[PDB]
Design a binder for this molecule. Structure first.
Ligand SMILES: O=c1[nH]c2ccccc2nc1C(F)(F)F
Lengths: 301, 296
């Protein structure tokens, strides 16, 4: 139906069906064992950020690859359940909709993961060329297929060029996996989110070290953001003033799965609402903190 | 008396095909993913259907989007879902299956959804005149014995020409299930049940457990790559070497393929030797393929 002009936040990236099983002891190959509990969860960075923005009170839309089937059916119903607009999905004729199987040992708490197959093609620049951008006030891209995502990001810059400053689409990028191909995405977006893993792999031993060491890579006037678990988060703008927020840990830590995604979405939300980078770092840390003492995303606000 | 009835589980098998079994706390990526209609009695229905045998499934199912897929698989196959004991409380069971492509080993992490099992009450509603054979997957032993007694009673009232052949499977090493040994013309005992009783071969297990079977019953024990063995009233051991494929890619449901093919051959009046041999034959073809298409 009718989405008002420049009203939505779009998240471009991965959706996956995570089957999570809790077991007494790790299964030995060729065995038939019974789990304590089993959960079917909708995962993926851009998918999780959508759930959060819906819960935060934001009209939001997801854009990722899915193949028609029963896995896609569960995921779409979950998106819809979290009030996410699913009309921009790139429906693929060939490939398997991602599904990862996870095994949690009730004993040592260790996570054994069997990642989804590579069969499904990622969203292309041509798939993206087809999108009428006027309904989006902000577009967020989870770095995956950088070459292609660069063309998408050039398109938003092109769109923006012919628009008044009050009708310009704000853009954020996320470099979460420590893969070389992605490091070119640093040059795009008004807000750049770099992870602890990417920073550590690049050498940096802290968020100040990362932000001071990678700010050169950003486009003129961009804000480089880094969350460092318990150390809270830092942000660095074009003024050179390193901003910081201490973490807001929960009384006890329940589930940290999707905490960075909660951080990203909350920062995007705060900025989209006209708040300062400092007000936004604080908001992000408050919400990502509340989430960690919760099972899933129910009651994060 | 035409159809073959299978009593037991139906489970959604969420399959991931790996090149090597994952190490604890590791993070491997699978080659392919698939959903499959699992559960022992359900797998046996796929096989019987494929062998051209009119069959039916009776098991507990919760209406939903999972069961809708399962029923669409049964229907695509030709399995009579009419006897499904539909429940209201709970969800349909589901399992995570890691299939090692290199050797075909299958690791199953099962989620049993508390779904109430098919009871003697559900079974009394069944018209036993359409059935040629009845196979029961050892689950609620005390409850299934009542279902078995009901079949013997129908048999006493019928000529040897129109009697129902009955087969039982004891797959899990649960002491409740040993009562089933017990009933039925054919009794399938798994290698894992046999090992859990101190037996180190299919021949050992048969010589040991035969005393526990109904008078005139055939006790059958498959032993993976070591083939299968059988023992009847005559006290003569029957053996069948296996039919391994050059490259073993999927052992998920091989035992159910064996059981169903053994039932199929016997239902068609072939000797226990021929049936043993056919079971190994079909279980072998299946191990070289992913799933069940192309086993015939
Ligand atoms: O691995 C196997 N598992 C079986 C399980 C039951 C009956 C026959 C089987 N054959 C094989 C194989 F050796 F032929 F492949």
């Amino acid at each position: 139906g009718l989405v008002p002009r420049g009203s939505q936040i779009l998240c471009v990236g991965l959706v996956v069906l995570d089957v999570i099983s809790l077991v007494d002891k790790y299964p030995k190959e060729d065995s038939e064992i019974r789990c304590l509990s089993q959960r079917w969860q909708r995962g993926g960075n851009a998918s999780n950020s959508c759930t959060v923005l819906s819960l935060l009170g934001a009209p939001c839309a997801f854009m990722g690859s899915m193949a028609p089937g029963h896995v896609a059916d569960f995921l779409v119903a979950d998106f819809r359940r979290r009030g996410v607009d699913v009309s921009q999905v790139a429906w693929q004729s060939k490939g398997d909709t991602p599904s990862s199987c996870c095994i949690i040992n009730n004993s040592n708490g260790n996570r054994t993961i069997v990642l989804h197959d590579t069969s499904l093609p990622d969203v292309s620049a041509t798939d993206f060329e087809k999108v009428d951008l006027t309904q989006f006030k902000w577009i967020h891209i989870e770095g995956r297929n950088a070459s292609e995502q660069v063309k998408m990001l050039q398109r938003i810059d092109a769109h923006n060029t012919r628009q008044p400053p009050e009708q310009k689409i704000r853009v954020s990028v996320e470099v979460e996996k420590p893969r070389e191909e992605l490091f070119q995405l640093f040059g795009y977006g008004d807000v750049v989110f770099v992870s602890k893993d990417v920073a550590k792999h690049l050498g940096f031993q802290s968020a100040e070290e990362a932000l001071r060491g990678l700010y050169g890579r950003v486009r003129k006037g961009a804000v480089l953001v880094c969350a460092w678990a318990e150390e809270g988060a830092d942000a660095l703008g074009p003024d050179g003033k390193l901003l910081h927020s201490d973490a807001f840990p929960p009384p006890r830590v329940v589930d940290t799965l999707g905490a960075g995604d909660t951080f990203n979405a909350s920062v995007i939300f705060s900025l989209s609402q006209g708040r300062s980078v400092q007000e936004a770092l604080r908001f992000g840390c408050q919400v990502a903190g509340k989430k960690c003492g919760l099972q899933g995303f129910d009651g994060i606000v």
